[PDB]
């Protein structure tokens, strides 16, 4: 009769999520649907090699597609054709070269999209696979939502901390009023 | 400064086979405990097995810690801090990425309840109380040793 172990679930890892993401891309071919601990351990040794290939692919894609086509991904409000031929045709029609059109495109980019676009910074070199990962894939890095809801932990960062809540003891009486209430100490009026 | 070594939660790399070894140790401990209730083994035999099977597992995890770091994540921030000899040793790293093992009550005896979790995974309430014996022993013996 199988025994409950608390180790029956494989630990969520960064390697497993990336390895599964690379499996569907075709960059890697795993033995089965789920990456084994041997494959995840092997992934750590060669993790940098696969990241560089994705980075090289993006540089090759940028070289071929062009600045307009490549960076249009982070400008949603840009509906014009971003192809190399379209950009050249637009320059012939209007005289605005590729750089002028490129500045025009980024004029419509929102600040939220710009921060996302910073993953393409030549210094940061963020992983192209990580930039386009869906939320459902990201959660598997730590293994989905916590069983204990975080809403229990959440507290607004402006709270007077009501001391009459269910988790607080009864209000502490003033010491020279609990004694007076229990008639242990007579008031000065009684004394005089 | 330029390289800027820095450790994160996932930098505390654990041996891949820890889950298997701990699960195997639990199965042996559970089967033996069941037969101890049946009367097929006596209390001392259970006591020795509990201490030894968890100590051997802890030592094996410590033994396999460096080759795993060398073969898989040579530039792991936690590995480089200890392997280069800059700060910390294997034992202290083992407390973070392996398992704290068995502590000792202030009489020299071994506490039969092991600490299967490390500091990254976090100790349970009972495991943390047990680990307070080692902390109390360490601080007290430090005063004795220096004086």
């Amino acid at each position: 009769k199988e025994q409950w172990s608390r180790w029956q679930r494989r630990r969520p890892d960064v390697e497993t999520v990336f390895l599964k993401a690379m499996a569907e891309t075709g960059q890697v071919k795993l033995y089965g649907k789920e990456p084994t601990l041997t494959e995840t351990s092997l992934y750590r040794a060669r993790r940098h090699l696969f990241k560089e290939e994705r980075l090289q692919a993006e540089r090759e894609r940028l070289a071929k597609e062009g600045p307009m086509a490549f960076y249009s991904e982070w400008v949603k409000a840009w509906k014009r054709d971003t192809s190399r031929e379209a950009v050249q045709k637009h320059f012939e029609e209007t005289g605005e070269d590729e750089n002028t059109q490129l500045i025009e495109m980024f004029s419509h980019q929102t600040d939220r999209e710009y921060r996302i676009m910073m993953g393409t910074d030549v210094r940061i070199k963020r992983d192209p696979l990580a930039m386009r990962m869906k939320e459902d894939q990201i959660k598997q890095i730590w293994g989905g939502d916590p069983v204990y809801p975080t809403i229990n932990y959440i507290q607004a960062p402006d709270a007077v901390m009501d001391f009459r809540g269910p988790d607080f003891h009864e209000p502490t009486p003033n010491m020279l009023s609990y004694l007076k209430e229990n008639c242990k100490v007579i008031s000065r009026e009684m004394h005089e | 400064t330029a390289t800027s070594i820095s450790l994160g939660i996932d930098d505390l790399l654990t041996i891949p086979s820890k889950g298997w070894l701990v699960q195997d140790a639990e199965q042996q401990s559970l089967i033996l405990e069941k037969h101890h209730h049946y009367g097929n083994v006596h209390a001392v035999e259970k006591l020795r097995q509990s201490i030894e099977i968890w100590y051997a597992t802890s030592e094996y995890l410590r033994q396999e810690m460096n080759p795993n770091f060398r073969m898989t994540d040579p530039f792991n921030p936690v590995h480089m801090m200890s392997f280069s000899g800059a700060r910390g040793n294997a034992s202290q790293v083992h407390q973070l990425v392996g398992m704290r093992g068995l502590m000792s009550d202030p009489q020299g005896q071994m506490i039969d309840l092991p600490i299967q979790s490390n500091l990254r995974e976090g100790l349970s309430l009972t495991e943390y109380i047990i680990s307070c014996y080692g902390a109390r022993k360490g601080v007290v013996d430090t005063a004795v040793r220096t004086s």
Partner: peptide, 29 residues
């Protein structure tokens, strides 16, 4: 000691440097 260790931690070698089995700049000084 960490900084010196990083300096002398040289190139990645073997399978950690190339994805596939092969089957670099020259500096005068």
């Amino acid at each position: 000691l960490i900084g010196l260790y990083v300096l002398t931690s040289g190139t990645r070698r073997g399978i950690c440097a190339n994805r596939y089995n092969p089957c670099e700049p020259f500096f005068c000084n």
